[PDB]
Amino acid sequence: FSEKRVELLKELSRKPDIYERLASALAPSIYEHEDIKKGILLQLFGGTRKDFSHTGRGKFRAEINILLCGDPGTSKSQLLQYVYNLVPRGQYTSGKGSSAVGLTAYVMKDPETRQLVLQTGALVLSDNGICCIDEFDKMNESTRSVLHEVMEQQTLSIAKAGIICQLNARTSVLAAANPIESQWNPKKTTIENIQLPHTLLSRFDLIFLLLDPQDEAYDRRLAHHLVALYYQSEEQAEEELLDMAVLKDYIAYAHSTIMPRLSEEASQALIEAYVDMRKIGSSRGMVSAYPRQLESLIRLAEAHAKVRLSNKVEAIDVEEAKRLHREALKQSA
Amino acid sequence: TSARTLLAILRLSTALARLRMVDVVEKEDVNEAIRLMEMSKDSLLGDKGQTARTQRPADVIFATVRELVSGGRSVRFSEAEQRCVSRGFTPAQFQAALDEYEELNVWQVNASRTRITFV
């Protein structure tokens, strides 16, 4: 790192439009649908990990887990291969092509060293980064069971075949589900559409769904955009959009310099906002009574203040955390 | 029809522009591209989607009078002809078309046929 690039990142932090310019850079084709990829930008930051070993709770993850759903090919074809070539800490793997125990750290015979040594996988090497994995709607049954402690307990405890080993690998994992008919059914609620159990969908933070309305005016703002950039070569990409060399250097500085934390005024809004989101009803009923969404709400406030380059969290970033969670409710209802 | 078929239309635009040894596209490469699409979707069924319309010599005449009913009631007979002769409607067929609807009780005229008012 040099001083010829850190000063340019500090001048953009004071601008109130840095959060909107960086969110639109991840959409090189689709004009709308910005709320889907809006939460992905905050996934790379996550938040500063804290320690509480003096109270009996040492391990604690501050990473954000985003949940997606839609047609694997319509609008999710570019959101699964673009976060792999730019981010160096990305590991791509297949769900159905790989085994359940083969993805993590399993046990395999080795007569060369005369000892049952362990083997690596894919998500166990991308620590403090981002993992890439597709096909979550038709994944293996045995693979869904081992995910109850990886992204939840942050401790892969595998004690079988006389092998006592507890891995401490943790990595934010994203998913892209799909309905039973790849289309939203207004005749049924959103609970029956998702085939995943209640214990699986509750571990995710936000939730979105790729909707294709049949409105006539909807195509006037989407079909007129892809054709405009279809015949144009490379005479406008580096003119109206910033390069990718700044995004890779913007996240490699705040992850080891700015450690934000909660205060006494901005933390009082998390209690009042938690009670209002409990008595929802109508759709499912009196749900959301777990410390899961309360813990995920704190991670959203730490990620918004990390992009602003400020350790002090005010009441402005708290109002922006609940706004992203409010849009996720109207999307799945 | 979703976003998967949107990019397929632009793909067929270059299949015909490269056959004439040119680097531009014309209207011929667009009409012929959608011609194979309409023929393929009709072959997936058991019939062909067509239409039926009879060129009535008094169908567009009643639609022209509708432009004056929504604006006023006492429409002048000489003023209503200021828009019929613009496109190219013959005035001889208008005299024989008034009795086709006045007989079926639609509007009414006077003795001199100079006052028309929508009832």
State how far residue B24 is from chain A, nearest Cα, in angstroms. Answer: 11
Q: Which residues of A touch B1 (CB under 8 A)?
A: none
Cβ-defined contacts of B1-8 (< 8 Å, 24+): B2/A71, B2/A74, B2/A212, B3/A74, B3/A75, B3/A212, B3/A222, B4/A73, B4/A74, B6/A223, B6/A226, B7/A226
CB contact at 8 A, B91 and B81? yes
| Residues of chain B contacting A71 with CB distance shorter than 8 Å | 2
The beta strand positions in chain B, using DSSP E, are 74-76, 107-108, 115-118
Alpha carbon of B13: minimum distance to chain A alpha carbons (Å): 10
Put simply, whether B8 touches A (Cβ < 8 Å) is: no
Place of tokens 């008094």: B58
- B7 touches A: beta carbon within 8 Å: yes
d(CA B69, CA B75): 7
Tokens, residue A171: 């990595």
Residues of A with CB under 8 A from a CB of B: 71, 73-75, 212, 222-223, 226-227, 230
CA gap A328, B6 in Å, rounded? 27
CB–CB of A41/A86 below 8 Å?
Answer: no
Q: State this model's resolution in angstroms.
A: 6.7
Task: Enumerate the residues of chain B whose CB falls inside 8 A of the CB of residue A73.
Answer: 4
H or E segment and range at residue A175: strand A175-177
Interface test with B, best of A32, A220, A231, A233 (most B CBs within 10 A): A231
The rounded distance, in Å, linking the Cα atoms of B89 and A143 is 75
Cα dihedral A248, A254, A257, A259 in deg (nearest 10): -160
* Eight-class DSSP state of B46: S
- Determine the Cα angle at A225 with ends A223 and A231, to 5°: 105
**Nearest Cα to Cα of residue A258 among A292, A302, A218:** A302
Residue A131 · residue A122 · CB < 8 Å: yes
Solving technique: cryo-EM
- HSE, CB side, 13 Å, CA atoms: give it for residue A329: 15
The pair of three-digit structure tokens given for residue A132, joined into one six-digit string: 């890439």
CA distance linking residue A163 with residue A304, whole number of Å: 42
**Letter for the amino acid at B14?**
T
Among chain A residues, CA nearest to B4? A74
The answer to whether the CB atoms of A226 and B4 lie below 8 A apart is no
Structural contact between residues A208 and A36, judged by C-beta atoms closer than 8 angstroms? yes
Longest CA pairwise span in chain B (Å): 71
- C-beta atoms surrounding A289 within 10 Å: 11
Cβ–Cβ below 8 Å for B6 and A223: yes
Question: Of A71, A73, A226, which has the smallest distance from its Cβ to B6's Cβ?
Answer: A226
Measured CA to CA in angstroms, residue B11 lies from A236, B15, B34, B38, B42 at distances of 21, 7, 12, 16, 21
Whole-angstrom Cα distance, residue B39 to residue A312?
A: 65
Give the minimum alpha-carbon distance from A96 to chain B in angstroms, rounded to a whole number.
24
CA distance B11 to chain A (A): 10
